[PDB]
Amino acid sequence: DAHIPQLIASEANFGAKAALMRSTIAQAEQAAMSSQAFHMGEASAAFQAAHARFVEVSAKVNALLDIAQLNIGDAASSYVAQDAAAA
Amino acid sequence: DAHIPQLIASEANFGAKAALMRSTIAQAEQAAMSSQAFHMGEASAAFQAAHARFVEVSAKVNALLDIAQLNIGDAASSYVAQDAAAASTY
Amino acid sequence: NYPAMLAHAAEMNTYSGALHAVGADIAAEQHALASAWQGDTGMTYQAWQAQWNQAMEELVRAYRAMATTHEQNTMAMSAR
Amino acid sequence: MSQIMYNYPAMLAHAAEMNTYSGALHAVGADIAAEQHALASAWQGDTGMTYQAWQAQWNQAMEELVRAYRAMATTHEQNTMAM
């Protein structure tokens, strides 16, 4: 009844947060990229290693948010909204 | 190269606003439902007609946001992020 | 009563303004990101821009119709 | 002279900025996790992944993202104070 809009709203809000998370990872990546007026040798090696890892884990986090968006996020709320229109 | 994080960011931000529209539509609907009660007959029928129309167009706008998302939004950004990671390690 | 109703009217007018503002903002952002757009479904960015704007007008007009009908009705109640 | 002493103010400011992103990533991740819990009963076996399984994988991945990011931050600070 009134549950439906409240569900749609909440699923949208989670969906916005998932997207802001994604945006934040990218921004963080750009801040890290510009810190590269700095390193050389084994600290750059440590930095490159740490970077490669951070890229790797991001892909993981984006993969996980794809799953959540389908279940309770932006896709989920879109589905419910259109479903309520159909019915 | 550094263009990639900018793209991902730009798209994710678009994806957020898409979700925030869906949220605004939903909050507008709650405010609409809670203000039907008052009316009766002709004034009500006009409201219900205006409501059924609004619920229809939200569906279309949601369908339209779904397209935006895949092209330049939440999903697009995810694909660029994950694609950047697979190319980076390989 | 008149206040409960008139409060709800003002509540709805918030959302009319909100729906418009963000839709326009979305419109602008989709244009700004035109170069990142391809025919995924098969829909062009121009097609989407036009369809988006058109659909944002009818959505806000649907909603304002509720707010107005609610507003015009309540004014009739207090005069009764 | 030192070139590390010459750029100290900006390198320090830049450390401050990177660390700001550690905090933002932690916070947004915690929210996402709380909200995913709040929405549990909306979650179905769509992927085949339960909500409990996702919660756990989310927190794990987030803890790993912040540490990976903090490793880079530290690599920077090491120069700023190498001086």
Residue numbers in the entry:
A (entry chain C): 5 to 91
B (entry chain A): 5 to 94
C (entry chain B): 7 to 86
D (entry chain D): 1 to 83
Copied sentences from the primary study:
Of particular interest are the Esx complexes which are dimers of two subunits (ESAT-6, early secreted antigen of 6 kDa; and CFP-10, culture filtrate protein of 10 kDa) and which are secreted across the cytoplasmic membrane by Type VII secretion (T7S) systems. Mycobacterial ESX secretion systems have been shown to be involved in a variety of physiological processes including conjugation in a non-pathogenic mycobacterium, iron and/or zinc acquisition by both pathogenic and non-pathogenic mycobacterial species, and virulence of pathogenic mycobacteria. The overall architecture of the complexes is similar to known Esx structures in that each heterodimer forms a four helix bundle with the CFP-10 and ESAT-6 subunit homologs each contributing an α-helical hairpin to the complex. The subunit interfaces in the four-helix bundles of the Esx complexes are similar to those of the previously determined Esx complex structures in that the intermolecular interface between the CFP-10 and ESAT-6 subunits is largely hydrophobic.
Using this expression approach we expressed and purified six Esx complexes and determined the crystal structures of M. abscessus EsxEF (EsxEFma), encoded by the MAB_3112 and MAB_3113 genes, M. smegmatis EsxGH (EsxGHms), encoded by the MSMEG_0620 and MSMEG_0621 genes, and M. tuberculosis EsxOP (EsxOPmt), encoded by the Rv2346c and Rv2347c genes, at resolutions of 1.96 Å, 2.70 Å, and 2.55 Å, respectively. The structures of these complexes were determined by single wavelength anomalous diffraction (EsxEFma and EsxGHms) and multiple wavelength anomalous diffraction (EsxOPmt) at resolutions of 3.0 Å, 2.70 Å, and 2.55 Å, respectively. The α-helices of each subunit are connected by a flexible loop containing the canonical ESAT-6/CFP-10 signature motif (Trp-Xaa-Gly; WXG) although the EsxGms CFP-10 homolog contains a modified motif (His-Xaa-Gly). The WXG-containing loops are well ordered in the EsxGHms complexes and in most of the EsxEFma complexes but the majority of the connecting loops are disordered in the EsxOPmt subunit structures. The average amount of buried surface area in the subunit interfaces varies considerably [EsxEFma, ∼1605 Å2; EsxGHms, ∼1555 Å2; EsxOPmt (form I), ∼1025 Å2; and EsxOPmt (form II), ∼1175 Å2] and the percentage of the surface of each subunit buried in the complex interface is also highly variable, from 13.5–33%, and is related to the degree to which the termini of the subunits are ordered and to the conformations that they adopt. The C-termini of the CFP-10 homolog subunits of our EsxGHms and EsxOPmt (forms I and II) structures, which contain the secretion motif, are ordered and adopt helical structures; in the EsxOPmt structure the secretion motif containing helix is an extension of the C-terminal helix of the α-helical hairpin while in EsxGHms the secretion motif is primarily contained in a short, 13 amino acid, helix linked to the α-helical hairpin by a short turn.
